[PDB]
């Protein structure tokens, strides 16, 4: 029974726009990381940077199906995005993160943190695309002086 | 040693306003449930309603410490809010939900569901108090159709 961190949300915009919001880093940087090196494409390695932490990460696009699926791997934890149209209303986005190894008891906190983090990604996505607002959920989860 | 679903977030408003957003259902309903049939007080038995889902839950306020802590029980799962002034930034809010039973792949999907759910509460809280916007995360998490 694979242990999966999961977050899902309806985004009330067309699927081509909601999919592009994860492919084009100039959009993704409105709600998730600080900057990304390039557009996602199948088989490509690239870096995502979180300037407000100390952190960047090289990722590899393992699968990219337009308006349907994104699978990326960190060099073997993986994160899958699935996009389904809800006709007339928008795009239902589902994020699943797998690859947690260890005692289940050491993984419960890791699964908690990943679930909250991808839930933040979707809520920021929604505020950005439906309201034009930068909610700053990623930065404000870990404020200075914490 | 207990399993906790948990979500935390900085809300950039004064602690008294951030605390009151959970005590007054005319405020809480802007980002979480549909309605609540009383203001929270120590020892009160209360119902909260999610009319969009046809669901309602009776809750008991076990502890209410003004601007510091709320502890609610459902008939026994418990949810704790802690509120802490980050003087140079705002109000850091932490939600911890305990009362998961079983220790395997039985509790992990439920701690995931709960972590996602309380993360949505805090992002909606942030959007409502900092931007005055109803993000509608709760209703749009389980859209009818699909």
Residue A7, token pair as written in the block: 């977050």
Query: Among residues B34, B9, B18, which one has the least CA distance to residue B123?
Result: B9
Bridging pattern class, strands A45-50 and B4-11? unpaired
**Beta-carbon neighbour count of residue B43 at 10 Å?**
9
Q: Find residue B83's DSSP bridge partners.
A: B93
DSSP per residue, B3-49: -EEEEEEEESS-HHHHHHHHH-HHHHTTTS-SEESS---TT-EEEEE
Q: How far apart are CA A89 and CA B48, in angstroms?
A: 28
Contact assessment for residue B126 and residue B17, using Cβ atoms and an 8 Å cutoff: no
Report CB contact under 8 Å: A105, B104: no
Residue with tokens 């992990």, as numbered in its chain: B108
CA within 13 Å, CB half, B48: 19
Residues B119, B143, A32, B11: is their CA dihedral positive or negative? negative
Residue A34 DSSP one-character state: S
CB atoms within 10 A of CB B79: 20
- Residue in this structure with the two tokens 């494409």, named with its chain if needed: A41
Residue at token pair 């309605």: B35
B10 touches chain A (CB under 8 A): yes
Phi/psi for A115 (5° steps) reads: -60, -50
**Tokens (6 digits) for A126:** 């929604």
Report chain A's C-alpha Rg in angstroms. 15
Which H or E run contains B68? none
User: In chain A, which residues have their Cβ closer than 8 Å to the Cβ of B82?
Assistant: none
DSSP state of B72: E
Specify whether the backbone of B50 is left (phi greater than 0), alpha (psi in -120 to 50) or beta.
beta
Provide the 3-class DSSP secondary structure of residue B76. coil
- Residue B128 burial (CB count, 10 A): 20
CA–CA distance, B79 with B4 (Å, rounded to integer): 10
Contact present, A50 and A34 (Cβ < 8 Å) = yes
Would an 8 Å CB–CB cutoff place A13 in contact with chain B?
Answer: no
**Is the minimum CB–CB distance between B145 and chain A shorter than 8 Å?**
yes
Distance CA A83, CA A91 (A): 7
Length of chain B equals 146
Q: Could you tell me which of A99, A97, A69 has the C-alpha nearest to residue A82?
A: A69
Identify the sign of the CA torsion B8, B9, B15, B16: negative
Contacts with A18 (C-beta within 8 Å, 6 or more apart), sequence order? A11, A83, A90, A91, A93, A125, A129
- Maximum distance among all alpha carbons in chain A? 45
Place of tokens 């906190």: A109
DSSP states along B130-141: HH-----HHHHH
Q: How far is A56 from chain B (nearest CA, A)?
A: 22
Residues of B in contact with A87 (CB under 8 A): 145
Edge to edge, the sheet with strand B90-98 lists B4-11, B90-98, B77-86, B69-74, B55-65, B45-50, B35-36
| Resolution of the structure in the document, Å | 2.0
> Is the separation of the CB atoms in A70 and A40 below 8 Å?
yes
Q: DSSP class of residue B142?
A: S
Q: Which of B92, B115, B124, B139 to mutate to test the interface with A (most CBs of A within 10 A)?
A: B115
**Method of elucidation:** X-ray
Q: Which residues of B touch A105 (CB under 8 A)?
A: 103
Residues of A in contact with B86 (CB under 8 A): 143, 145-146
H/E run at residue A33: none
Residues 6+ apart with CB under 8 A from B119: A7, A115, A116, A119, A120, A123, B7
Q: Choose, out of A111, A115, A118, A130, the residue to mutate when testing the contact with B (most B CBs < 10 Å).
A: A115
Give chain B's end-to-end CA distance (angstroms, integer).
39
Strand bridging mode B69-74 / B77-86: antiparallel
| A25-33 CB contacts, 8 Å cutoff, 24+ apart | A27/A128, A30/A124, A30/A128, A30/A134, A31/A121, A31/A124, A31/A125, A31/A127, A31/A128, A31/A134, A31/A135, A31/A137, A31/A138, A32/A121, A32/A124, A32/A125, A32/A138, A33/A138
Q: Do B6 and A116 touch (CB under 8 A)?
A: yes
Domains delineated in chain B: 4-141 (3.30.530.20)
CA separation, residue B87 to residues A48, A57, A125, B93, B103 (Å): 31, 32, 28, 13, 39
């Amino acid at each position: 029974a694979q242990v999966v961190a999961k977050a899902e949300m309806l985004i009330r915009r067309p699927i081509a726009e909601v999919f592009e919001a994860f492919v084009d880093p100039a959009i993704t940087a409105r709600f998730w990381f600080s900057r990304g090196d390039a557009r996602l494409e199948a088989g490509k390695r690239l870096r995502w940077h979180w300037d407000m932490y100390g952190v960047s990460q090289e990722i590899e696009v393992k699968d990219l199906q337009t308006n349907r699926r994104i699978l990326i791997e960190w060099p073997p934890s993986q994160v899958e995005w699935l996009f389904e149209e809800l006709p007339g209303a928008g795009t239902f986005v589902s994020i699943r993160n797998s690859g947690f190894v260890g005692t289940p008891e050491e993984v419960i906190p890791r699964v908690v943190d990943a679930t909250e983090g991808f839930t933040l990604v979707l809520a920021g996505l929604k505020a950005c695309l439906e309201h034009g607002i930068a909610l700053n959920l990623v930065a404000d989860r870990f404020p200075r002086g914490l």
